[PDB]
Design a protein around this nucleic acid. Structure first.
Lengths: 351, 351
RNA sequence: CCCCCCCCCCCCCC
């Protein structure tokens, strides 16, 4: 009885982490970066996307990534993409005639977005009294962070479906980015958000670049109010892909009686093993599903189904479940759990 | 159920703190400093803003920051700007025929301020009996500190709004700065406070410079009453942007019964996690919102709606809430906590 | 196989 122990999940994690062989992916592909000396240039484009109405927003995500490249530096971004498991060579961007030339992003798109911005600015200046503030202009230094805030909104909804991600991005951007939607009325959150989702699907090393930018920005001593907003949304993205662990600790806090069930008590050992694996991985365990790290799925609580049923029932009783489409394996446990959770929530008690 | 534990907030701070990459911003920008060799000159300017009635008070904040630069030194100020995450290139200050040519400050403005002060001095010397005391003249050595005191008053309200900040600055400066107002009858605290708010919003690295001056002044072995007043106000700004944590420890000190409610006791774990993160950051945690450090927002108690509602209710019962504009998520807890806090306040019990 | 919900922050007085 005492000596019959397995510790399967610790062995699996040790098997995965202890490889001395590294696999090279994206071996023949080249991405684009913009050197920090061109920050002031890419601050213009990142704004000329916002304050005008464009037919196409296809490469707006790449433009935000170019701003991230300028913020970190071309050499540091190359190192970030090389330490991210991708053998992607990096191409520098060139200013020509001034305008920008970015690898991959066609120059027709750049010249079109610039021309639309110029025409809109002329229309808004001629018909007005020549009075446009500093924060209503594409030159403003917080426009790239506004684009990256749309990107960070779509970043949180990366473990979800594209349609759900776009819906949530639009809803949360009409609130979070209310000031920007006052200063730049013509910015199209659906299309910019869909561009960011497309980028984060096609280029997975750019998830790592985005995460490094979030780290660097949060480590900064000072920042504008847009950078603080970006960091807040980025931290809202932290636990993405592992809401079941969060609702499990929530079920423990709620003291759900059906956690004492026979099946839940039978599965608590493997549950604690999953949580111990989370602790053993450490601070990077939250970014596993964001990075699309193959090591994720070691943190799934799927093989313990009755604990998951009880946890989803507790969440439903608390009303927290929302529209979470996760499967409920056993329905009886789920129903009893939500009954008790609602009964506890309704009653007001003092300890 | 002992192992069902996550510790998300510590992991988020670990990610933000453990960054191997440094951000780069304001790359192509420059700012002005004034060497200590010009302090005796900048003092004059910093006082010629105070005893005359000027049409434009646009750059008074820049003149206060110039005096700070004279105090710390040009090289130390450049280092301070560099370690604040901003790659602003310091531009030195020169003299011309003497007056100052400060970078980014129009010479027309400096000439206007000097001429207005000279005309006012001539008018108050010709009509009056010619008994101007040593403290009433512009070349007084505490005038730069008197201007920086208005700056420090508006500094304590950088987390608040502009209108609240200006109203509070004027209200508090009629009493905090009564002696300076007597010495300089015509000093416009509203316009100078507006100038300082504009500087703090536009140039965020000057928040770091202003904090470094506060530290270099508080660490001094001796000081005048003006510098002691400035340090008093600067320390009154310490917990800016985090009044919810202060009110939470107030509620715990008040032994509010609704802290023992079921939901409050449910959220107390992560509340204590936030306080542990506060202790982990240490002395510089208070200056996070003043600096607009993007790392601020890890200290938010918005993810504990019931604890926040109880804290706000306790504050409202004790009369501390004043006119606080935060949200009360759970109104029943807020009202119950307010009732208990009023009941405890009314009763006078001595042990 | 796995994932799937919601959610910027701040705001008083001295």
């Amino acid at each position: 009885l005492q000596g019959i122990h397995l510790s399967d999940l610790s062995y699996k994690h040790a098997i995965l982490k202890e490889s001395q062989y590294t696999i090279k992916r994206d071996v023949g592909t080249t991405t684009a970066v913009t050197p920090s000396s061109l920050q002031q240039e890419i601050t213009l484009l990142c704004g000329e996307i916002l304050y005008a109405k464009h037919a196409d927003y296809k490469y707006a995500a790449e433009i935000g990534i170019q701003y991230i490249s300028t913020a970190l530096g071309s050499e540091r971004v190359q190192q970030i993409l090389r330490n991210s498991g991708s053998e992607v060579q990096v191409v520098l961007t060139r200013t020509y005639s001034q305008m920008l030339d970015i690898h991959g992003v066609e120059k027709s798109w750049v010249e079109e977005i610039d021309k639309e911005a110029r025409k809109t600015m002329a229309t808004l200046l001629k018909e007005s009294s020549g009075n446009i503030p500093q924060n209503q202009r594409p030159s403003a230094p917080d426009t790239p962070i506004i684009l990256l805030c749309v990107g960070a909104l779509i970043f949180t909804k990366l473990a979800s479906t594209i349609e759900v991600g776009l819906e949530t991005t639009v809803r949360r951007a009409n609130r979070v980015l209310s000031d920007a939607l006052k200063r730049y009325p013509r910015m199209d959150i659906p299309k910019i958000a869909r561009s960011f989702y497309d980028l984060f699907e096609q280029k997975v090393y750019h998830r790592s670049l985005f995460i490094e930018y979030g780290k660097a920005l949060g480590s900064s001593s000072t920042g504008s109010k847009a950078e603080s907003l970006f960091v807040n949304i980025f931290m809202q993205a932290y636990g993405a892909g592992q809401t079941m662990l969060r609702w499990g600790v929530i079920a423990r806090s709620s003291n759900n009686i059906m956690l004492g069930h026979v099946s839940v008590q039978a599965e608590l050992k493997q549950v604690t093993e999953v949580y111990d694996l989370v602790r053993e991985m450490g601070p990077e365990s939250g970014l596993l599903h964001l990075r699309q790290s193959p090591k994720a799925g070691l943190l799934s609580l799927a093989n313990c189904p009755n604990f998951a049923s009880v946890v989803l029932g507790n969440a439903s009783g608390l009303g927290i479940i929302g529209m979470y489409r996760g499967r409920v394996p056993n329905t009886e446990l789920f129903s009893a759990a939500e009954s008790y959770a609602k009964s506890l929530k309704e009653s007001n008690k003092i300890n």
